Design a protein around this nucleic acid. Structure first.
Lengths: 99, 193, 148
RNA sequence: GAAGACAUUGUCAGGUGGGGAGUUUGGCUGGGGCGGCACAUCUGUUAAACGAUAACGCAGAUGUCCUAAGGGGGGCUCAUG
RNA sequence: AAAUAUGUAAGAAGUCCUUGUUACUUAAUUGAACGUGGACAUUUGAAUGAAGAGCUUUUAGUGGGCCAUUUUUGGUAAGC
RNA sequence: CACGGACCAAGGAGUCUAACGUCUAUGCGAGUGUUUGGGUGUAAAACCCAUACGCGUAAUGAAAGUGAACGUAGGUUGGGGCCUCGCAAGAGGUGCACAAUCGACCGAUCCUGAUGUCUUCGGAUGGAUUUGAGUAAGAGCAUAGCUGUUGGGACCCGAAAG
RNA sequence: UUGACCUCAAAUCAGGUAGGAGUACCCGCUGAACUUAAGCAUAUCAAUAAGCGGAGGAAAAGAAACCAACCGGGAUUGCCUUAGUAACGGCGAGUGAAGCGGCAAAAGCUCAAAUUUGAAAUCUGGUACCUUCGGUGCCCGAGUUGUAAUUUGGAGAGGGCAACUUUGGGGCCGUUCCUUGUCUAUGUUCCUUGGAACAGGACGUCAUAGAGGGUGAGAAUCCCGUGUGGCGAGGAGUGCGGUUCUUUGUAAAGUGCCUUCGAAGAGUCGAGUUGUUUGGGAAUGCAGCUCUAAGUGGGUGGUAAAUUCCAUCUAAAGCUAA
């Protein structure tokens, strides 16, 4: 970044030799792990698809991805929740559906 | 109710505030009791300076970012930079802060010199029973004071170049104000077909 | 000292000097800013003109720290120079030997332009200044080293 | 035995809800009430030759109407006999 | 078309002379306004009076009024 | 021919506080404010103190933001005092405070829109029966008092009620 | 059919523990109206009084699902200030915090989630003995649906290399602390008044003691105490401070470097809505119902929304003095 050295502007402030902070593991809180990765793998096929999601995947194959997200937002909460979710379903389609 | 040229007063005494009152008559007693409990902790804390070695740091926001202040700990990177470990620095009286980071080399060397000055001041007693008498100081903060880093020399030569400074600001303002629209323009321009 | 109070001079006068035709009856015009728009409206318009009503745009969660910018026109300025140094620097006004004045470290954000200054070369580092503040310094053969 | 994914219970939503709750239920005023408006107004008078001046004093009007019944110019002269 | 009431004026912040400014005004430094310099003393521009004149702050009480003379409205009139 | 008052004693009613305006006293004075806290002590006193922070020293905008000398910090009338001449009467110089007044300056608003420019930024200079709680060789800070204010049980006693 | 196991039982079963009180303060819940608004319904009063449940010597809080936007800061708490401000409010009456700063005080941490697996290493009880706030032995039982060791995000773990640093636990007596006990100067001289001397007057006294109280009136000096310390008693307590008993330990820990990893809490988070409260305003929190996630994700960034970024913390689990 490097502050332009002055009071206002895009990089407002004094520029005193950056020191590259330590790599705190906590920033990597949302860790994946070959463990959980493979754990959630099983559980998904074990428990299967949750009934509101059946309506969801079919929702796509029928009216489309756009309309399904509208229903995924009126299902979960945040919009991103829905996009991440819908995108996750095409991963489920791509598998069983094709190869 | 409302008469004369008097300035509108907002006194919030409509509640039964007469039961939440706290006249500090104990102001004196508190002081003494606070100095004795402090002077007794010292005659139990043995030769240690009550308070540990508090670090130098630079206070936040547009306002105080020009005043270096006695922080809290010492980051785990600066203790390894001093040579000793944190699981040890606390047992020696060198206040350590795990969550504080380090993005300023000046503040950094300011603390490692603050730690070197101190590792050459401590009179650690090994767990034997010899106990080499070295009296007891009463202030770790008094012994290692803080002096805002020397910024510039009182005098220097006048280096003019005709930037006006006032213009460098006014412009720098606009460059931040229209950075966006000008960024969308280079977006709606690089989009030639 | 309740000893000099006028109530001492009102003992034995009957109405404690609060009149006997209108007395001192608890709260006659309501309480506090009561009936501001009603009966006490004349006392408002004049004495408190433009009291009722909204005006600007609201700034939800405003830290005053974001605004700190204590001004300091040139009128003073030479006052951020210790008594002694001032004498020396003033008379022996010359480049190379220009005093570096740190307005920020002094406790001032902006530098304005008021009571002129002695035709002397001066380095004035500040967070931000006025147009005429820098124009007055530039005539005294001085710079404006912007900081933050 | 009857009953059966309906009842029920829970959550929101519409209806009902003086059974109940809270409260309000102008002023002036020859007592109040009714009537009125003297309550924002305007013409003349009362008003006592400056101005001001009251009564539920007197005689009336207003909440509108006007793209001309506004603005400018030209020509003209009205009611009545 | 009175009487009683009522506005103003009765000077130096003036009047007279002179001639300076202007982005106003005029056909025109014509004129307006405002000055430079100049002339003019209390018989300096009526009477009378003046326990000073001018000025700001702040604050109490009061915001039921009533009577008389004369004018005057209602009202038979009323200590209305 | 309104009400309280049979008589005496002792109770008995404009208080305290937070914040304020005026005025005055005092310290200091572009500063002021030690008393949160720390140092100290004969110890709730007294005395000593760092840093902050408060108010002030700059206003103005709704805000982004901008921010106070054409000149001896201006012209004019008036000004106490002081000064020069004069026995005096006065005449002239100087005129602070303050008053009126014409200006200049800083922000607001409405206009002007220069050299330049990431061709839309920039915003010089110049205007306006426009505006402001402004500048124009600072006066504030604190403490105490009278008086007044507000919130308070709030001068003392008193409802029917909720 | 005999013994399991799971669950449910069962007792005047072995041992425990709970209630009630107090309730200044603390922790929640519940919850008003008088009152202010000159009326009154929003609001206010007030997230108060009353009601109810629950603790301690403090409680709670407490190590970041924070503040921030800085050159960043760095648990909490309290105080000065922020500020009667930002903000909320029939934008009426009114109400009204936060970050920064200074200071007081400082304290840091621990579990789940890992093949101990060449070895349950774990603990309650029972009983004997004992050197007992327990130990040891043995026997039950708990327990593999998980107790020990290991690691808690600051990290840290496995394998590998290479060396180095560091000890632990009991007595006894000083000290530290709580309660304490006793000893510790100085006239009862003279005259006067008086019922009485502690009053007046004269002469002295000790004074680290002229605080106070008592005594037949104002008593330092009579009495107790006061002052200065002295010296004993009984506990607490190993804070420390010397000595003495044990070397506990192919015991554990920390440190460097290589590499592969590194699990991190869901009917929760968040959203919709309802009520509610807050200064919080397209919603501060809390709660009810309904939907109900993810993993370089999630929360947060005080104007809802989409897109693109950054900063910043690591929830939904826990402990802790001042």
């Amino acid at each position: 970044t490097v502050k332009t050295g002055i009071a206002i502007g895009l990089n407002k402030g004094k520029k005193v030799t950056s020191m590259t902070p330590a790599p705190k593991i906590s920033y990597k809180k949302g860790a994946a792990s070959n463990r959980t990765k493979f754990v959630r793998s099983l559980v998904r096929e074990i428990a299967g698809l949750s009934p509101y999601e059946r309506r969801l995947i079919d929702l796509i194959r029928n009216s489309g991805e756009k309309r399904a997200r509208k229903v995924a937002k009126k299902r979960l909460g945040s919009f991103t929740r829905a996009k991440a979710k819908v995108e996750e379903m095409n991963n489920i389609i791509a598998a069983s559906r094709r190869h | 109710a409302i008469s004369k040229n008097l300035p509108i007063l907002k006194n919030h005494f409509r509640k039964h505030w007469q039961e939440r009152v706290k006249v500090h008559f104990d102001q004196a007693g508190k002081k003494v009791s606070r100095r004795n409990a402090r002077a007794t902790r010292a005659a139990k804390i043995a030769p240690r300076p009550l308070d540990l070695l508090r670090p130098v740091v630079r206070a936040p926001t547009v306002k105080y970012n020009r005043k270096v202040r006695a922080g809290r700990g010492f980051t785990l990177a600066e203790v390894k930079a001093a040579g000793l470990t944190a699981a040890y620095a606390r047992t020696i009286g060198i206040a350590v802060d795990h969550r504080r980071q380090n993005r300023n080399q000046e503040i950094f060397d300011a603390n490692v010199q603050r730690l070197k000055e101190y590792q050459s001041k401590i009179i650690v007693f090994p767990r034997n029973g010899k106990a080499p008498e070295a009296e007891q100081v009463l202030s770790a903060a008094a012994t290692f004071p803080i002096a805002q880093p020397a910024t510039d020399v009182e005098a220097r030569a006048v280096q003019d170049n005709g930037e006006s400074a006032f213009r460098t600001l006014r412009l720098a303002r606009s460059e931040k104000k229209f950075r966006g629209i000008r960024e969308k323009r280079a977006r709606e321009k690089a989009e030639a077909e | 000292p309740s000893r000099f109070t006028k109530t001492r001079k009102h003992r034995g006068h009957v109405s404690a000097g609060k009149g006997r035709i209108g007395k001192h009856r608890k709260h006659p015009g309501g309480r506090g800013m009561a009936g501001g728009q009603h009966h006490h409206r004349i006392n408002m318009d004049k004495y408190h003109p433009g009291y009722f009503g909204k005006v600007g745009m609201r700034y939800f969660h405003k830290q005053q720290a974001h605004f700190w910018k204590p001004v300091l026109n040139l009128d003073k300025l030479w006052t951020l120079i210790p008594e002694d140094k001032r004498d020396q620097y003033l008379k022996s006004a010359s480049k190379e030997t220009a005093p570096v004045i740190d307005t920020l470290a002094a406790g001032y954000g902006k530098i304005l332009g008021k009571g002129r200054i002695p035709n002397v070369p001066v380095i004035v580092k500040a967070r931000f200044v006025s147009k005429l503040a820098e124009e007055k310094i530039r005539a005294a053969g001085g710079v404006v080293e912007l900081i933050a």
